[PDB]
Amino acid sequence: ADAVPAYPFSLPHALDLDPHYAELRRDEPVSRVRLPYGEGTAWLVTRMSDARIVLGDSRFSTAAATDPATPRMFPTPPEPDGVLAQDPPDHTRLRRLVGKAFTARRVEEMRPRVRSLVDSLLDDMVAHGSPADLVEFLAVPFPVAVICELLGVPLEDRDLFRTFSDAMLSSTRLTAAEIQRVQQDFMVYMDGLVAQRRDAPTEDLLGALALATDNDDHLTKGEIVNMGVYLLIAGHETSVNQITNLVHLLLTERKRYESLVADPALVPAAVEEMLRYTPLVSAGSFVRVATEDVELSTVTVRAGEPCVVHFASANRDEEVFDHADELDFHRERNPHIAFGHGAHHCIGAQLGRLELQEALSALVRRFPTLDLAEPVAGLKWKQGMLIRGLERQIVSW
Ligand code: HEM
Ligand SMILES: CC[C@H]1OC(=O)[C@H](C)[C@@H](O)[C@H](C)[C@@H](O)[C@@H](C)C[C@@H](C)C(=O)[C@H](C)[C@@H](O)[C@H]1C
C-alpha cells in the first residue's frame, strides 16, 4: 500500500547519470524513495544547497541510521563503531585518532615517495610492452602500495584485504550474511594487525591505533579497530576505481587527454573537474536521520525522517556550475562535493587528490600515444557494488 519509486531508479551504465536526476533537480529536488534495504521511505536530495544542509547540519544524525529499520543502500545494517555512524562531538574525538596523518601538509610530504612509485609501476608496464591492462599495472598496485606503507599493512596481504573490501562495498552482489561473515574476518584480521604492535610499536597509523588501545580511556577497541578497516577499504577502493574512471573519461573523447598532454599543469584542475563529473558513488549515500524538523528548499524534513544525498547530482546543479552537463578543465570556480561535506568530509581528500594527480601527470607525460585497445561496448564495469569503476582497462601506446 505505497507508491514511492524504488531507488536506485535503474541499474547503472558506465559513468552515465540516470536522467531522472536532472528532472528531479528542476521539478522535485526533494522526493520520497524506497531504498533497497531497511523499512519505509527516505527523502532523496539532488540539489547542492540541500545536500550541504543534510551533510552540514547537526540536526542530521548518522548515528541514528544504525537502527536496522532505517533505510540504507547496502545489505548489512551499519556498524555503530564505524566513523560514518558517529555524530560530533564523539566523531571529532575519533577523527582526531588518525587526522594528523591526512592533513594537506603531511600528504604533500608524500608526493616524492608516491611519484617514484607511480614511476616504478609505469616501468613494469613498458617492460611488458603494449598492449597491457592499466588496472593490472597501475590502478590496483599503486593505491594498494601507498595505503599499505601509510597504514603499515603487509603489501603481501593484498589479495586477502582486496577480497574483504570488494565484499563490504557490495550493493546487490552479496547478501547480508555473506557480508556480515566478511566483516567479522576483517575486524579479527585488523584486530590481529594492531596487537602485533603490543610489545613492538611502529611509526605508522596502525602504531597510532595500537597506542590508542591502552593510552586513550574515551575511545573503544570497536571504534579504534574499525578505523583501521575503514581507512584500509576506503584508502585503496576509491583511488583504484577513480583512476580507471578518469582515464576512461579522457580516452573516450581523446580531445581531453590531448589537452592534458599539451599542459600537464591542467592535471590538478581536471582531476577536480573529473571528481565533480564522475559518479564514483553509484547511488545514494550513508543515510542521515533528522533529530529536529529541518527546512530544505521545498520541504520541511520532520524529526525521524531519513534523507539520502546523491553526490553526483549535486555536482550537476546548473544553479551552481555553468554548463554542468559538460566537462570543462578551465572553470574558474568548482565548489564540488565529490569528497562530501561537513563532519564526514573525506579524511583522504588530500591523499586521493595527490594519488590521482601523480597517476595522470605520469601517464600524460610518458605516454602521449595512449588510447583504449578494447571496444567501449565490451568494457567490464564492476556490477552490484556501491561504487563504479572498470575491472580491466586494456591500453595501447
Ligand atoms: C578519489 C578519491 C576519493 C573520493 C572521490 C572519495 C569520496 C568520498 C566521499 C564522497 C565521502 C563522504 C561520505 C559521507 O559523508 O556520506 C568520503 C568519505 C571518506 N573517504 Fe573518501 N574518497 C576518496 C579517497 C579516500 C581515501 C584515499 C581514503 C582513506 C585513506 C578515504 C577515506 C574516506 C573516509 C574514511 C571517509 C569517511 C570519513 C568520515 O566518516 O568522517 N577516501 N569519501
Ligand atoms: C552508500 C554508499 C556508501 O558506502 C557506505 O556507506 C559503506 C557501507 C561504508 O561502510 C564503506 C564500505 C566505507 O569503507 C566508507 C568509509 C568508504 C568511503 C569511501 C565512503 O564514505 C563512501 C563515499 C561511502 O559513504 C559510500 C560508498
Author numbering: 11 to 407
Question: Can I see the authors' text?
Answer:
As predicted, the substitution of G92 with a tryptophan and S240 with a tyrosine resulted in filling the solvent cavity, which is occupied by the bulky aromatic sidechains. This reduces to some extent the volume of the active site in both mutants, which is ~606.7 Å3 in the wild type and ~582.5 and ~566.8 Å3 in G92W and S240Y, respectively. In G92W and S240Y mutants, the bulkier and more hydrophobic groups are located in the cavity, causing, respectively, the partial and the total displacement of the solvent molecules and resulting in the formation of direct interactions between the enzyme and the substrate. Within the solvent cavity, the aromatic side chain of S240Y and G92W form additional direct and directional contacts with the substrate and with other residues within the distal pocket, inducing the partial or the total removal of solvent molecules from that region. The insertion of a tryptophan in position 92 and of a tyrosine in position 240 also generate additional contacts within the protein structure, involving residues located in the active site of the enzyme. The superposition of the modeled open structure onto the crystallographic closed complex suggests that the presence of a tyrosine at position 240 would jeopardize the enzyme closure since its repositioning could lead to a collision with the BC loop at residues 91–93. Indeed, while the effect of the ionic strength on the spin state equilibrium of the wild type and E89Y is comparable, showing the total low-to-high spin shift at I = 2.5–3 M, in G92W and S240Y mutants the shift is not complete even at the highest ionic strength conditions tested (I = 3.5 M). Therefore, at physiological ionic strength conditions, substrate binding to G92W and S240Y mutants cannot trigger the structural transition that induces the displacement of the water molecule from the sixth coordination position of the iron and the spin-state shift, not even on a partial population of the enzyme, as it occurs in the case of wild type and E89Y variants. On the other hand, in crystals obtained at higher ionic strength (I ~4.4 M), we observed only closed monomers of the complex for all mutants.
The 8.8a-oleandolide epoxygenase OleP, from Streptomyces antibioticus, is the P450 involved in the polyketide biosynthesis of the antibiotic oleandomycin. It introduces an epoxide function to the C8-C8a of the macrolactone ring of two structurally different intermediates, namely the aglycone 8.8a-oleandolide (DEO) and the C3-mono-glycosylated L-olivosyl-8.8a-deoxyoleandolide (L-O-DEO). Substrate binding to the cytochrome P450 OleP is coupled to a large open-to-closed transition that remodels the active site, minimizing its exposure to the external solvent. When the aglycone substrate binds, a small empty cavity is formed between the I and G helices, the BC loop, and the substrate itself, where solvent molecules accumulate mediating substrate-enzyme interactions.
